[PDB]
Scaffold this active site. Sequence first.
Site, PDB file in Angstrom:
ATOM      1  N   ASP A  71      88.203  32.501  62.197  1.00 13.54           N
ATOM      2  CA  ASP A  71      89.178  32.425  63.312  1.00 13.54           C
ATOM      3  C   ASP A  71      88.639  31.874  64.646  1.00 13.54           C
ATOM      4  OD1 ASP A  71      91.597  32.832  64.680  1.00 13.54           O
ATOM      5  OD2 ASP A  71      91.363  34.991  64.861  1.00 13.54           O
ATOM      6  N   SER A 108      93.841  38.087  72.424  1.00 17.43           N
ATOM      7  CA  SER A 108      93.401  37.190  71.356  1.00 17.43           C
ATOM      8  C   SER A 108      92.866  35.870  71.895  1.00 17.43           C
ATOM      9  CB  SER A 108      94.571  36.886  70.404  1.00 17.43           C
ATOM     10  OG  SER A 108      95.175  38.029  69.775  1.00 17.43           O
ATOM     11  N   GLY A 109      91.775  35.347  71.353  1.00 17.72           N
ATOM     12  CA  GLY A 109      91.159  34.107  71.779  1.00 17.72           C
ATOM     13  C   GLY A 109      90.120  34.289  72.881  1.00 17.72           C
ATOM     14  N   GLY A 137      97.637  39.790  73.299  1.00 18.12           N
ATOM     15  CA  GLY A 137      97.574  39.139  74.594  1.00 18.12           C
ATOM     16  C   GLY A 137      96.122  38.884  74.946  1.00 18.12           C
ATOM     17  N   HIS A 189      94.112  31.506  65.353  1.00 15.02           N
ATOM     18  CA  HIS A 189      95.462  32.071  65.282  1.00 15.02           C
ATOM     19  C   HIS A 189      96.230  31.914  66.616  1.00 15.02           C
ATOM     20  CE1 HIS A 189      93.737  35.993  66.948  1.00 15.02           C
ATOM     21  NE2 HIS A 189      94.955  35.973  67.448  1.00 15.02           N
TER      22      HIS A 189
HETATM   23  N1  BAO Z   1     102.619  34.341  68.028  1.00 12.61           N
HETATM   24  C1  BAO Z   1     101.319  34.034  68.231  1.00 12.61           C
HETATM   25  N2  BAO Z   1     100.954  32.757  68.436  1.00 12.61           N
HETATM   26  C2  BAO Z   1     100.348  35.045  68.234  1.00 12.61           C
HETATM   27  C3  BAO Z   1      99.159  34.896  68.995  1.00 12.61           C
HETATM   28  C4  BAO Z   1      98.163  35.908  69.055  1.00 12.61           C
HETATM   29  C5  BAO Z   1      98.361  37.068  68.306  1.00 12.61           C
HETATM   30  N3  BAO Z   1      97.531  38.127  68.228  1.00 12.61           N
HETATM   31  C6  BAO Z   1      98.284  38.880  67.393  1.00 12.61           C
HETATM   32  C7  BAO Z   1      98.033  40.231  67.008  1.00 12.61           C
HETATM   33  O1  BAO Z   1      98.612  40.639  65.986  1.00 12.61           O
HETATM   34  C8  BAO Z   1      96.889  40.941  67.467  1.00 12.61           C
HETATM   35  N4  BAO Z   1      95.997  40.361  68.306  1.00 12.61           N
HETATM   36  C9  BAO Z   1      95.125  41.375  68.456  1.00 12.61           C
HETATM   37  C10 BAO Z   1      93.926  41.341  69.189  1.00 12.61           C
HETATM   38  C11 BAO Z   1      93.170  42.534  69.233  1.00 12.61           C
HETATM   39  C12 BAO Z   1      93.580  43.728  68.560  1.00 12.61           C
HETATM   40  C13 BAO Z   1      92.762  44.866  68.581  1.00 12.61           C
HETATM   41  N5  BAO Z   1      93.232  46.054  68.280  1.00 12.61           N
HETATM   42  N6  BAO Z   1      91.474  44.768  68.879  1.00 12.61           N
HETATM   43  C14 BAO Z   1      94.811  43.685  67.832  1.00 12.61           C
HETATM   44  C15 BAO Z   1      95.574  42.501  67.782  1.00 12.61           C
HETATM   45  N7  BAO Z   1      96.717  42.252  67.093  1.00 12.61           N
HETATM   46  N8  BAO Z   1      99.461  38.408  66.950  1.00 12.61           N
HETATM   47  C16 BAO Z   1      99.496  37.229  67.560  1.00 12.61           C
HETATM   48  C17 BAO Z   1     100.486  36.242  67.499  1.00 12.61           C
END
Ligand code: BAO
Length: 223
Positions: free
Chosen positions: A84, A177-178, A175, A40
Amino acid sequence: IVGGYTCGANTVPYQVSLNSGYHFCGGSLINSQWVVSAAHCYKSGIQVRLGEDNINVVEGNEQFISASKSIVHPSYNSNTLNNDIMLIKLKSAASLNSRVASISLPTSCASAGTQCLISGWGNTKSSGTSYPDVLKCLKAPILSDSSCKSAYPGQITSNMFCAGYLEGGKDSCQGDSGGPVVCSGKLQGIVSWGSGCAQKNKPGVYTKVCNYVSWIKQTIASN
Ligand SMILES: N=C(N)c1ccc2nc(C(=O)c3nc4ccc(C(=N)N)cc4[nH]3)[nH]c2c1
Ligand SMILES: [Ca+2]
Protein backbone atom coordinates in the site's frame (compact mmCIF):
# COMPACT_ATOMS: atom_id res chain seq x y z
CA ILE A 1 -5.73 10.68 15.25
CA VAL A 2 -7.50 9.44 18.41
CA GLY A 3 -5.89 10.40 21.82
CA GLY A 4 -3.15 12.58 20.29
CA TYR A 5 -2.48 16.33 20.66
CA THR A 6 -2.32 19.42 18.48
CA CYS A 7 0.99 19.40 16.66
CA GLY A 8 1.47 23.06 16.43
CA ALA A 9 1.36 24.90 13.20
CA ASN A 10 3.89 23.68 10.84
CA THR A 11 5.93 21.66 13.35
CA VAL A 12 5.53 18.59 10.97
CA PRO A 13 6.76 20.43 7.82
CA TYR A 14 6.77 17.31 5.49
CA GLN A 15 3.05 16.56 6.10
CA VAL A 16 0.84 16.94 2.95
CA SER A 17 -2.95 17.04 2.57
CA LEU A 18 -4.31 15.44 -0.56
CA ASN A 19 -7.38 17.43 -1.66
CA SER A 20 -9.94 16.67 -4.36
CA GLY A 21 -12.38 19.36 -3.34
CA TYR A 22 -11.93 18.33 0.34
CA HIS A 23 -9.13 16.69 2.34
CA PHE A 24 -9.26 12.86 1.89
CA CYS A 25 -5.69 11.51 2.70
CA GLY A 26 -2.31 12.66 4.06
CA GLY A 27 1.09 12.15 2.42
CA SER A 28 4.79 12.99 3.00
CA LEU A 29 6.99 15.30 0.87
CA ILE A 30 10.14 13.37 0.07
CA ASN A 31 11.77 16.06 -2.16
CA SER A 32 10.60 19.21 -3.97
CA GLN A 33 8.73 17.34 -6.79
CA TRP A 34 7.54 14.12 -5.10
CA VAL A 35 5.03 12.98 -2.44
CA VAL A 36 4.63 9.43 -1.04
CA SER A 37 1.13 8.35 0.22
CA ALA A 38 -0.93 5.09 0.42
CA ALA A 39 -2.14 3.39 -2.81
CA HIS A 40 -5.66 3.11 -1.34
CA CYS A 41 -5.67 6.95 -1.44
CA TYR A 42 -5.41 6.89 -5.30
CA LYS A 43 -7.86 9.20 -7.09
CA SER A 44 -7.69 11.07 -10.38
CA GLY A 45 -7.62 14.93 -9.85
CA ILE A 46 -5.44 15.34 -6.72
CA GLN A 47 -4.18 18.71 -5.53
CA VAL A 48 -1.39 18.51 -3.02
CA ARG A 49 -1.53 21.10 -0.24
CA LEU A 50 1.71 21.83 1.53
CA GLY A 51 2.40 24.13 4.62
CA GLU A 52 -0.98 23.42 6.05
CA ASP A 53 -2.11 23.70 9.58
CA ASN A 54 -5.89 24.39 9.66
CA ILE A 55 -7.15 22.88 6.37
CA ASN A 56 -10.19 25.09 6.39
CA VAL A 57 -8.39 28.38 6.78
CA VAL A 58 -5.78 29.90 4.46
CA GLU A 59 -3.24 31.08 7.18
CA GLY A 60 -0.63 32.22 4.67
CA ASN A 61 1.94 29.38 4.62
CA GLU A 62 0.26 27.07 2.13
CA GLN A 63 1.42 25.95 -1.29
CA PHE A 64 -1.36 24.41 -3.41
CA ILE A 65 0.07 22.33 -6.30
CA SER A 66 -1.63 19.97 -8.71
CA ALA A 67 -0.38 16.37 -9.15
CA SER A 68 0.95 15.67 -12.76
CA LYS A 69 1.13 11.93 -12.31
CA SER A 70 0.38 9.20 -9.77
CA ILE A 71 2.18 5.76 -9.67
CA VAL A 72 0.57 3.03 -7.49
CA HIS A 73 2.97 0.26 -6.53
CA PRO A 74 3.09 -2.46 -9.28
CA SER A 75 2.07 -5.18 -6.71
CA TYR A 76 -0.57 -3.27 -4.71
CA ASN A 77 -3.37 -5.61 -3.73
CA SER A 78 -6.47 -3.67 -2.81
CA ASN A 79 -8.01 -6.64 -1.11
CA THR A 80 -5.18 -7.33 1.39
CA LEU A 81 -3.74 -3.87 1.20
CA ASN A 82 -0.34 -5.48 0.67
CA ASN A 83 2.16 -2.97 -0.92
CA ASP A 84 0.00 0.00 0.00
CA ILE A 85 2.17 2.85 -1.33
CA MET A 86 1.96 5.26 -4.28
CA LEU A 87 4.12 8.20 -5.44
CA ILE A 88 2.62 11.47 -6.65
CA LYS A 89 4.69 13.95 -8.77
CA LEU A 90 4.02 17.63 -8.50
CA LYS A 91 3.24 19.76 -11.53
CA SER A 92 5.78 22.35 -10.31
CA ALA A 93 8.38 22.04 -7.53
CA ALA A 94 7.45 23.04 -4.05
CA SER A 95 9.42 26.01 -2.52
CA LEU A 96 11.12 24.49 0.50
CA ASN A 97 11.59 26.53 3.65
CA SER A 98 11.01 26.05 7.42
CA ARG A 99 7.29 25.41 7.03
CA VAL A 100 7.54 23.09 4.00
CA ALA A 101 10.46 20.61 4.26
CA SER A 102 11.12 17.11 2.87
CA ILE A 103 11.53 13.97 5.04
CA SER A 104 14.38 11.44 4.56
CA LEU A 105 13.89 7.86 3.40
CA PRO A 106 15.35 5.16 5.71
CA THR A 107 18.71 3.56 5.17
CA SER A 108 17.45 0.50 7.22
CA CYS A 109 14.22 -0.69 9.02
CA ALA A 110 13.31 0.45 12.54
CA SER A 111 13.13 -1.97 15.47
CA ALA A 112 10.27 -2.83 17.77
CA GLY A 113 10.15 -0.35 20.61
CA THR A 114 11.40 2.63 18.52
CA GLN A 115 9.15 5.70 19.19
CA CYS A 116 7.57 7.28 16.12
CA LEU A 117 5.53 10.42 15.40
CA ILE A 118 2.28 9.80 13.41
CA SER A 119 0.28 12.85 12.25
CA GLY A 120 -2.93 13.68 10.41
CA TRP A 121 -6.27 15.44 10.11
CA GLY A 122 -8.30 12.28 10.60
CA ASN A 123 -11.17 11.31 12.91
CA THR A 124 -10.45 12.00 16.60
CA LYS A 125 -13.21 9.77 18.16
CA SER A 126 -13.24 5.89 18.42
CA SER A 127 -16.98 5.40 18.77
CA GLY A 128 -18.26 8.39 16.87
CA THR A 129 -17.16 10.98 14.42
CA SER A 130 -15.31 14.26 14.92
CA TYR A 131 -12.98 15.73 12.41
CA PRO A 132 -10.22 18.26 13.41
CA ASP A 133 -9.32 21.22 11.25
CA VAL A 134 -5.75 21.43 12.57
CA LEU A 135 -3.05 18.79 12.38
CA LYS A 136 -2.98 16.20 15.16
CA CYS A 137 0.13 14.27 16.30
CA LEU A 138 0.66 11.02 18.27
CA LYS A 139 3.84 9.43 19.60
CA ALA A 140 3.65 5.68 19.33
CA PRO A 141 6.10 2.74 19.48
CA ILE A 142 6.58 0.14 16.80
CA LEU A 143 5.19 -3.07 18.20
CA SER A 144 6.62 -6.55 17.93
CA ASP A 145 5.64 -8.66 14.97
CA SER A 146 4.29 -11.34 17.23
CA SER A 147 1.80 -9.00 18.80
CA CYS A 148 1.00 -7.42 15.41
CA LYS A 149 0.30 -10.84 13.88
CA SER A 150 -1.58 -12.20 16.90
CA ALA A 151 -3.88 -9.13 16.66
CA TYR A 152 -4.62 -9.83 12.91
CA PRO A 153 -4.11 -13.56 12.12
CA GLY A 154 -3.17 -14.38 8.56
CA GLN A 155 -3.34 -10.70 7.53
CA ILE A 156 0.10 -9.17 8.21
CA THR A 157 2.72 -9.53 5.48
CA SER A 158 6.40 -8.64 5.51
CA ASN A 159 5.49 -5.26 4.13
CA MET A 160 3.44 -4.14 7.17
CA PHE A 161 4.15 -3.24 10.79
CA CYS A 162 2.00 -2.31 13.75
CA ALA A 163 2.45 0.77 15.89
CA GLY A 164 0.50 1.96 18.87
CA TYR A 165 -0.94 0.69 22.15
CA LEU A 166 -2.71 -2.66 22.70
CA GLU A 167 -4.74 -1.20 25.57
CA GLY A 168 -6.17 1.09 22.88
CA GLY A 169 -7.15 4.71 23.38
CA LYS A 170 -4.42 6.06 21.04
CA ASP A 171 -4.30 5.37 17.24
CA SER A 172 -4.42 6.70 13.66
CA CYS A 173 -7.97 6.75 12.15
CA GLN A 174 -9.82 7.42 8.84
CA GLY A 175 -8.71 10.66 7.30
CA ASP A 176 -5.15 9.85 8.45
CA SER A 177 -4.52 7.29 5.63
CA GLY A 178 -1.45 8.03 3.45
CA GLY A 179 0.18 10.03 6.27
CA PRO A 180 3.69 9.77 7.78
CA VAL A 181 5.10 7.58 10.55
CA VAL A 182 8.55 9.13 11.22
CA CYS A 183 11.01 7.40 13.61
CA SER A 184 14.49 8.84 14.21
CA GLY A 185 14.25 11.42 11.53
CA LYS A 186 13.32 8.90 8.75
CA LEU A 187 10.04 8.11 7.06
CA GLN A 188 9.43 4.54 8.23
CA GLY A 189 5.66 4.02 7.80
CA ILE A 190 2.58 5.07 5.92
CA VAL A 191 -0.90 5.05 7.61
CA SER A 192 -2.58 2.06 5.93
CA TRP A 193 -5.35 0.25 7.85
CA GLY A 194 -6.51 -1.13 11.22
CA SER A 195 -9.73 -2.46 12.86
CA GLY A 196 -11.79 0.63 13.84
CA CYS A 197 -9.69 3.18 15.74
CA ALA A 198 -8.03 3.00 19.12
CA GLN A 199 -9.76 -0.29 20.22
CA LYS A 200 -7.97 -2.55 22.72
CA ASN A 201 -5.79 -5.07 21.04
CA LYS A 202 -6.36 -3.56 17.64
CA PRO A 203 -3.21 -1.45 16.77
CA GLY A 204 -2.83 0.49 13.51
CA VAL A 205 -1.07 -1.14 10.53
CA TYR A 206 1.49 0.78 8.50
CA THR A 207 3.23 0.16 5.15
CA LYS A 208 6.88 -0.70 5.94
CA VAL A 209 8.67 1.98 3.77
CA CYS A 210 12.18 0.53 4.37
CA ASN A 211 11.16 -2.40 1.97
CA TYR A 212 10.42 0.12 -0.88
CA VAL A 213 13.40 2.53 -0.94
CA SER A 214 14.92 0.98 -4.12
CA TRP A 215 11.52 1.09 -5.86
CA ILE A 216 10.97 4.76 -4.74
CA LYS A 217 14.41 5.92 -5.73
CA GLN A 218 14.31 4.12 -9.15
CA THR A 219 10.81 5.35 -9.94
CA ILE A 220 11.36 9.07 -9.05
CA ALA A 221 14.58 9.07 -11.13
CA SER A 222 12.87 7.78 -14.23
CA ASN A 223 9.79 10.00 -14.13
N1 BAO B 1 -12.83 6.48 -0.25
C1 BAO B 1 -11.48 6.51 -0.15
N2 BAO B 1 -10.74 6.94 -1.19
C2 BAO B 1 -10.85 6.09 1.03
C3 BAO B 1 -9.59 6.64 1.40
C4 BAO B 1 -8.93 6.27 2.60
C5 BAO B 1 -9.54 5.31 3.42
N3 BAO B 1 -9.06 4.83 4.58
C6 BAO B 1 -10.09 3.99 4.86
C7 BAO B 1 -10.28 3.25 6.06
O1 BAO B 1 -11.06 2.28 6.01
C8 BAO B 1 -9.35 3.31 7.14
N4 BAO B 1 -8.24 4.09 7.06
C9 BAO B 1 -7.69 3.83 8.26
C10 BAO B 1 -6.46 4.32 8.73
C11 BAO B 1 -6.08 3.93 10.04
C12 BAO B 1 -6.89 3.08 10.85
C13 BAO B 1 -6.44 2.68 12.12
N5 BAO B 1 -7.26 2.19 13.02
N6 BAO B 1 -5.15 2.75 12.43
C14 BAO B 1 -8.12 2.62 10.30
C15 BAO B 1 -8.51 2.99 9.00
N7 BAO B 1 -9.60 2.61 8.29
N8 BAO B 1 -11.12 3.89 4.00
C16 BAO B 1 -10.74 4.77 3.07
C17 BAO B 1 -11.41 5.13 1.89
CA1 LIG C 1 -4.79 26.38 5.86
